Amino acid sequence: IVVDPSSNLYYRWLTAIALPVFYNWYLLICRACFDELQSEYLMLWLVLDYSADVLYVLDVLVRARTGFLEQGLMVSDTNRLWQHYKTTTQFKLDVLSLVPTDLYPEVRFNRLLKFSRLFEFFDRTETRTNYPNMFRIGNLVLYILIIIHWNACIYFAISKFIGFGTDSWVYPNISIPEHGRLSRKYIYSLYWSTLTLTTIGETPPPVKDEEYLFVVVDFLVGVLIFATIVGNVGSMISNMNASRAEFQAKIDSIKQYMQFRKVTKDLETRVIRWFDYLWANKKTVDEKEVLKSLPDKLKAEIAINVHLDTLKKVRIFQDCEAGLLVELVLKLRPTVFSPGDYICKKGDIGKEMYIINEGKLAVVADDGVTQFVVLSDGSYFGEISILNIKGSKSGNRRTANIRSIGYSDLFCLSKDDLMEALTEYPEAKKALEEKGRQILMKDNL
Amino acid sequence: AIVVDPSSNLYYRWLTAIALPVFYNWYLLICRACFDELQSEYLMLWLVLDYSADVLYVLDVLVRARTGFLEQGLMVSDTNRLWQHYKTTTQFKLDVLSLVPTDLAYLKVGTNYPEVRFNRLLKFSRLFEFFDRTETRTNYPNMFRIGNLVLYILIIIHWNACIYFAISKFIGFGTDSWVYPNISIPEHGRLSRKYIYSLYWSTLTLTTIGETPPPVKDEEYLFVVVDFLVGVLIFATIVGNVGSMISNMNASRAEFQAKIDSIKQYMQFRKVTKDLETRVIRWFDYLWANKKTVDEKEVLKSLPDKLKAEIAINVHLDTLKKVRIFQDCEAGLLVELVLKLRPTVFSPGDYICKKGDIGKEMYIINEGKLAVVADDGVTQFVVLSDGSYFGEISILNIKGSKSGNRRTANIRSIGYSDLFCLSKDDLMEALTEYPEAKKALEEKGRQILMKDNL
Amino acid sequence: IVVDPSSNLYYRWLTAIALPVFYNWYLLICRACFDELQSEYLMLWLVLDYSADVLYVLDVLVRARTGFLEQGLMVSDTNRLWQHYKTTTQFKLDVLSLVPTDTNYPEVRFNRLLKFSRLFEFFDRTETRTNYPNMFRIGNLVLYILIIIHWNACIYFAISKFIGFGTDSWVYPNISIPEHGRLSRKYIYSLYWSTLTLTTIGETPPPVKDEEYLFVVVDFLVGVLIFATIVGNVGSMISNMNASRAEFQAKIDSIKQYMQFRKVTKDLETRVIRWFDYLWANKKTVDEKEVLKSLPDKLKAEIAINVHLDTLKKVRIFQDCEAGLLVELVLKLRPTVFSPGDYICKKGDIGKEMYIINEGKLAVVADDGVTQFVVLSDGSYFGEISILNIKGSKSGNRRTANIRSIGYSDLFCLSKDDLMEALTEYPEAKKALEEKGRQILMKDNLIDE
Amino acid sequence: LPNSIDSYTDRLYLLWLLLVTLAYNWNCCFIPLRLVFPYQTADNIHYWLIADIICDIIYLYDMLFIQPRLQFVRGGDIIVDSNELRKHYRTSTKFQLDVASIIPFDICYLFFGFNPMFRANRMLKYTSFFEFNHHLESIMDKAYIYRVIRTTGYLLFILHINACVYYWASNYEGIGTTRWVYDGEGNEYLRCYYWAVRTLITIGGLPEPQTLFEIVFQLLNFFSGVFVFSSLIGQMRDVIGAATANQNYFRACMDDTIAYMNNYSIPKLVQKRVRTWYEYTWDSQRMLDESDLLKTLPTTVQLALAIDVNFSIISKVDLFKGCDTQMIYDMLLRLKSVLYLPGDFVCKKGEIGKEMYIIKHGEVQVLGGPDGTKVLVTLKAGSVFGEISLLAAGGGNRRTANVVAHGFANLLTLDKKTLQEILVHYPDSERILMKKARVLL
Ligand SMILES: Nc1nc2c(ncn2[C@@H]2O[C@@H]3COP(=O)(O)O[C@H]3[C@H]2O)c(=O)[nH]1
Ligand SMILES: Nc1nc2c(ncn2[C@@H]2O[C@@H]3COP(=O)(O)O[C@H]3[C@H]2O)c(=O)[nH]1
Ligand SMILES: Nc1nc2c(ncn2[C@@H]2O[C@@H]3COP(=O)(O)O[C@H]3[C@H]2O)c(=O)[nH]1
Ligand SMILES: Nc1nc2c(ncn2[C@@H]2O[C@@H]3COP(=O)(O)O[C@H]3[C@H]2O)c(=O)[nH]1
Ligand SMILES: *[C@@H]1O[C@H](CO)[C@@H](O)[C@H](O)[C@H]1NC(C)=O
Ligand SMILES: *[C@@H]1O[C@H](CO)[C@@H](O)[C@H](O)[C@H]1NC(C)=O
Ligand SMILES: *[C@@H]1O[C@H](CO)[C@@H](O)[C@H](O)[C@H]1NC(C)=O
């Protein structure tokens, strides 16, 4: 079998191999430095180390049968997969992490060489999850807890090397039953390392030169840790409200424009209420900028999936070419209208055709509140004035006032957009002109 | 009957009136749960405030049963459909869980355990909604962001003070050096002293100052290391929030200063003369200081076409209607013409147009002062002022004109002008759907030039 | 000989002159303030100061022969280089750092610290030349704070010696005690005090006199300011490190919100999510027209002919074209990335683009099922006749068969309008292209119109 | 004194704003110091009164003889008439703050004795400090240095105010009563400033608060110190991120180009040439493109910056001598700046010709020797070559000689297509150009 790195089985294996790597780092430095975790829970550490080595050789096999991409296609032959896995330095890191050094748990510090699986699990979870900033604070707390734990183990090893209870800086005398417990040892070492790496420093001061030097190095490392934590959380907060700051900057610039150009209070509060609607309905980003980073094939497929069943129900586009409808939904433009907004007044130049989506319009009667007919979802208007038929009775002029009752979302197919969409389909252009001429001869010509 | 608009002002008044007792419930419920003297000494006050909070909670579920929502762009106004749309939400479950009558157990324990009212903290969504509506509604966004961050970290510091006092009560008062001192001492037994020292300890721990006594037991060591890591996280979010405030407060000023440094580097690299360099720099400083530095086309790009047309009407239509050739034109033609108007700014002494130049623009003066100077320099013949216009005959291109499209006079700027430019090509693109109006404009220009010189 | 300031020999000399500058700063302040480091290792400091002064003299001699760009070309006239050096303030700083001021008082050698510009130039050139600029910025910040901690240690020891050893609880302890009298403990306790003061921790003994109070206030203020700037620099570096990831995630979340609001079906939603996961996974997040936007056409043409020219020369109509026409045609190419199963062009579609296959495998499939007639590979092409549009074609700008992607293809499109734009300066080559297309259409299928 | 102060090109006005800033900073510093500390003794009161009279005299001179002479812009035109300047100052909002600052509450010294709380309205003249900051940032080249100095001064002022409030709390609780209050040993201001530094920088290490007033004081001071340190870090981060934004943008686009050329396996000679282009562009221009900078400016300043750079150069060209000034201006605005590396061919002998080259800050060499490498003419900066190739139709003009760049030549290019799209609006100069092409070719 061949696994591929983009599937879900690969991410489940990334979790299943990120568990024993974190176990190896954490509990290997703890057992190497504390000497009672290793002594008391010996069968538990034997079981967990056997499980970690089993998952390590299984990771070697999975990396041996993990595919890659050449010429866009996934490679699936195990010989070339094995050679490509072998020529990489990750193969040497895996073999060096699986040397039989068990033939004092510090000999198992080769097992810490599989850190790339933990970093790959963190990267894949960060790109897969839907709470990326919550996972980022989780990863930051995990990294700084690893450093706090490793510094606690280093402090206990240094105080054991100097001597227990010989100094005021080192760990107290473990022959006393209060300082002799493993829980007291680990939690006091963790408290010391936390005070020293959070640059609080309420610890007893050093008395020897190696202790002074270790405390200097520890306080500078804690300074770098605090700077990294603050930088990551600050960039995360700057990313968490970048869209809010962009929309507030746009609102502030438009309000400054409306104050500088002396826009009246009615239009000013109409613009303010429009932006309040645009934020309270989460429409803060425009689709014309949203659909630029996509390729043309996915843009065309999204335009089909949104507008093709709507455009196919238009009476002039019932028997047109599928490629012509593809170009037409590529040239569709969506606009949102406020309540009471006139889409078109009677007597204006008709150069756009609007198809209603998720809205409710009304044909009002000569700048009045009385409505003749109420248009609804899926319907359209302006289907004839944009075709530019010779000998029209109307002459590209709207014969009715259409107001918006609520917030409508129309799709605007312009005259120029239809003319540049009809330039590579001339037979479809003549058929569209024939259908418009037929509709005009039926109703009024 | 009555349906409250969620975008109105009455909804924000109710958001304030329901964000008061939620914050009260959080703060004083953890305080009365962990401090044990606030509950006993002020029992009538807490009965009054809990009854008022429960009244506001049932009024909130009655309000949430009657807020409209947007489908098909219209506000839903039938109480039955509003009630089913509320009942099919998790917020209805959170509200009926926040209104669970645990006051029977509160009366069974003798009104000494306010821990049964901890389900009242399940209406945090009203507090977050009030903060969101205020941060999009108010005129002081950075000041509100600082107040919101201060409120959040004070809730956390207060909860950690209550947790520290509960841990000290569980371990023993005054039995250790880390726990709260012996409350039988009359100085340590005051409730103000208890709360203020617990809040002081919690602030020192959660802000990574740590001027506190050191732990002496394993649970105290573990609580202190967990509190110190939570405190370094809290300090990181405080520094990041204030840094984002500072970065957002002068973002426009930093953008203008980056523009100024870019133009200065261009004028140093291209060896632009010093007089024009100071002219351009003083021009941009004027545009900043008089609050007109932004580009109108880039500012109005985020608006829809209907609001852009309405703003262009409200700014330029009453000024374009005073032009003599556009006196009797179609309303849609004037709307397209004020949409085609592009603005330009001018410096003192800047030439708008010189004599013998090809006329392709029609300028309309707005907040400026121009001057029809001679060809030698600055000798004002006519001082052109606000509301006036020029260049309206040369862009019409009247056939058989003895002046053609040439500028008959030199026009300089005296101060800082803000003209509105209508291009000849933009006029011809706006006159494609109006052939009758194009012929009328041509005939009016022909009549004016026949009155003057044809 | 003229040393080119953009060469590699100049960077080798920047290393060889930034070594004694860092030596001079660090060990000159330590020897000046500790009075035993100068006294014990005296021959070592004589050797190192002789080497540093010889390197300073050679630095003046190298700066006297370093070129500069005037009107785009490097000046090689040694007299012009010498006068241009002489009219600089760096010449004054170098000759002030080379005055013969020269045993137990190495504070007469403090003019040697005036060559800080060579250390700053070395750091700037290393950050320019490296491939890990944020890692070098972290290293440079660490070196700056180490220099500051060391200088504050020397200042604290000098202040303690001026006040009196062991006369206060704040000053350095009595050096007549054999524990405190060691040079290692002197330097290491001064470094410990300086770390605890400049990092604004403050767990050292508090001052007892007014001069000590004033020095500790000034030292805490210098440390707070410096550390705040350090934390702001690290934060700006982190925010500019994850800026591309933040922009790509903003684009992903915007398109996800659009697809959720417009009720796009789950199959197309999964396809767009998989394409975005492939993009970042392949770090192909940037766009070609965005990353080659500011380059000149000469360098864009060199970049384009190092990838596309060997494929464009194999095209049956672009066999014997002109070199300049092939340059224009490889500059007119536009990349298009396709998903697996994406149809490039179907039967009946409008033909206006010629696709060039680069790192992909296409298949000319039939209409009903996936029956691959020809498997088009890397270096191949299709669609030249549709962009030629020869008069009298029965096709009429329509593709014959269907072509879909088997895997992720990066096709490069030469459209018909771009071909006619590149053929404005080559009318004979346009006529030859039309003749070759008419010959191909004559041997395949063509009406005479 | 002049009748009108420019307030932009007047350095005497910057010095006067410095004097009013020094008076305002003297007031803000020495009103709480004299209010709290016992430094306003009866044997020292005359020097304090002399300094307060000097500060009030500076305030009065600013209110009366300088600010009414400030030029301003009303509706675009610059106002010079002193009557209009005086009414604009009198009806301003600065005059309200100046009057409310210079309100003589010093006459209450006869009633309530010498007390600097009556001078506390003199801290309402902050607008002069703010315009001094604005004018100093405008005259300074690198204003982040003054931003850092201002942030340092704000930190020192808030620590000074904290030292004054701590000495007030020590005098209120009693000096030397508890362990937390000031004991009275050495310099009162220096030791209270030490306490303020260690508290508002959240260093600690001081005696613990004993009573409830001291615990509340220490808690509020530590919270304020957390926010002061956070604002200090945020200000330094804003200064650093604004100071290095252009350099980091240039490095980001250079890394994007390098990642592209590494993804497409482009050779190391081409990668070295691209890196040389990026390095010389950062050395000379300190920006990637001038076109996306100039396209953000208005058309009038675009035309002025194009004229002042290239108008004499194109007016020396014989081909566009009969053409008209507006078409020449459009061809000025539509020029393109390209940078050639040393040894780059700008015109290969035999290739097509479609551009006119304006060489600015460079040197190109026309190779027309017998082998093809001998230099005939070395065209220095400000020259124009290949201008007759702008008028040929179709293929037309082929290049007749190899022209290479000697060093880094920064040519300016006008395309034939660009000249045609300019010429579709200017028919008379179009006829002159075709007649010149017919008589020359
Ligand atoms: N004239 C007219 N148009 C109607 C009516 N009901 C819906 N409409 C649409 O309203 C329109 C307004 O613009 P159009 O002239 O473009 O075309 C018209 C029709 O599509 C009706 O009763 N009369
Ligand atoms: N010739 C002229 N033009 C004037 C005068 N007052 C205002 N104007 C406008 O100034 C102009 C400058 O450009 P135009 O030739 O286009 O047209 C001219 C008029 O519209 C005046 O007294 N003479
Ligand atoms: N019809 C056809 N086209 C092929 C074949 N092999 C490669 N191609 C290319 O596939 C094409 C698809 O588009 P075109 O019609 O534009 O032109 C066709 C050819 O250039 C083949 O066997 N048949
Ligand atoms: N051949 C040639 N061209 C020169 C010389 N001096 C300047 N030039 C210009 O250099 C040119 C390079 O391009 P062109 O062939 O287009 O035309 C040539 C001339 O306009 C010279 O001595 N010989
Ligand atoms: C630790 O305690 C034991 C007995 O309790 C004692 O013998 C030993 O000396 C002590 N160690 C130190 C370093 O004091
Ligand atoms: C607290 O004080 C009371 C009386 O002062 C005493 O009885 C009690 O034991 C004290 N508690 C502790 C823990 O010391
Ligand atoms: C330092 O020690 C010496 C000898 O131990 C002693 O004479 C001297 O007084 C000490 N100095 C101080 C300041 O105590």
Residue numbers in the entry:
A (entry chain B): 159 to 261, 270 to 611
B (entry chain C): 158 to 611
C (entry chain A): 159 to 260, 268 to 614
D (entry chain D): 206 to 646
Provide the authors' original text about this structure:
Cyclic nucleotide-gated (CNG) channels transduce chemical signals into electrical signals in sensory receptors and neurons. They are activated by cGMP or cAMP, which bind to the cyclic nucleotide-binding domain (CNBD) to open a gate located 50-60 Å away in the central cavity. Here, we report structures of the cGMP-activated human cone photoreceptor CNGA3/CNGB3 channel in closed, intermediate, pre-open and open states in detergent or lipid nanodisc, all with fully bound cGMP. In eukaryotic CNG channels, the main activation gate is located in the central cavity and is formed by two hydrophobic amino acids in S6 (the cavity gate).
First, to increase A3 and B3 expression level and protein stability, we removed amino acids 1–151 and 1–78 on the N-termini of A3 and B3, respectively. Third, A3/B3 was reconstituted in nanodiscs with simply 1-palmitoyl-2-oleoyl-sn-glycero-3-phosphoglycerol (POPG) and 1-palmitoyl-2-oleoyl-sn-glycero-3-phosphocholine (POPC). Second, a cGMP-bound closed-state structure, named ND_cGMP_closed (36.6% particles) was also obtained, at a resolution of 3.11 Å. This structure is essentially identical to GDN_cGMP_closed, the closed-state structure of full-length A3/B3, with an r.m.s.d. of 0.44 Å, indicating that the N-terminal truncations do not alter A3/B3 structure. In the closed state, the C-helix of the CNBD is in a “down” position. In the closed state and intermediate state 1, R410 of A3 and R456 of B3 are the only amino acids on the gating ring (i.e., helices A’B’) that interact with the TMD, mainly D289 and E292 on S4. In ND_cGMP_closed and ND_cGMP_intermediate, R442 projects to the ion conduction pathway with up and down orientations, as in GDN. In ND_cGMP_closed, R442 interacts with V396 of A3R in the up orientation but with S404 of A3L in the down orientation. Strikingly, even though all four subunits of all the channels are bound with cGMP, most of the channels are in closed (36.6%) or intermediate states (55.8%), and only a very small fraction of the channels is in the pre-open (1.7%) or open states (4.3%).
